[PDB]
Amino acid sequence: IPDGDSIRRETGFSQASLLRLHHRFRALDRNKKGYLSRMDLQQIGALAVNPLGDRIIESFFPDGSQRVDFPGFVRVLAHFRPVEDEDTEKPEPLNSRRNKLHYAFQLYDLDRDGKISRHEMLQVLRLMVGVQVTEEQLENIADRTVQEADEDGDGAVSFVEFTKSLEKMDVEQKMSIRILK
């Protein structure tokens, strides 16, 4: 029996959904003060080994906050809420393609300047490259990568050129929380 009224409203989560969440959020909460800290979330072992774990972690904290209210915890997970036919049949749900892309985009563009520099791409790359790759091959890839996606030649990737680069991508699905269903 939480504030899951206007919450189930902003995230479009089904009753039992927020329940499995609140329950899950309850488990993540250690000292139990109705909030989470990088501390609490970093306890998720699997996430730690996740090359994006830290960026995912930080995404749960706005501008400078250091704690996540339950509604904030869900505000994020809401982006990965599976899309229902009713969602597409009204305010834009946090799980729309546009918002899923924005979320992913915000993980590349750390300085939140609106564009993905060659460096911001290079950092993401060094995170996901099994075989030891020369810092040069990377610069080359990060380069080519931004190069290919860069349309207005400003050297960086705007959200639109980002969106554009994924038009043939099944983003909806590649970003929908399976388990929840």
Partner: peptide
């Protein structure tokens, strides 16, 4: 299968996983 598609694929993949792990199994 452009370079982007590949990078982003792995990215969204590592992303979803982390998220699902935040939700727990």
């Amino acid at each position: 299968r452009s370079i982007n598609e590949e990078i982003h694929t792995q990215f969204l993949d590592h992303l979803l996983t982390g998220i699902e792990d935040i939700c727990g199994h």
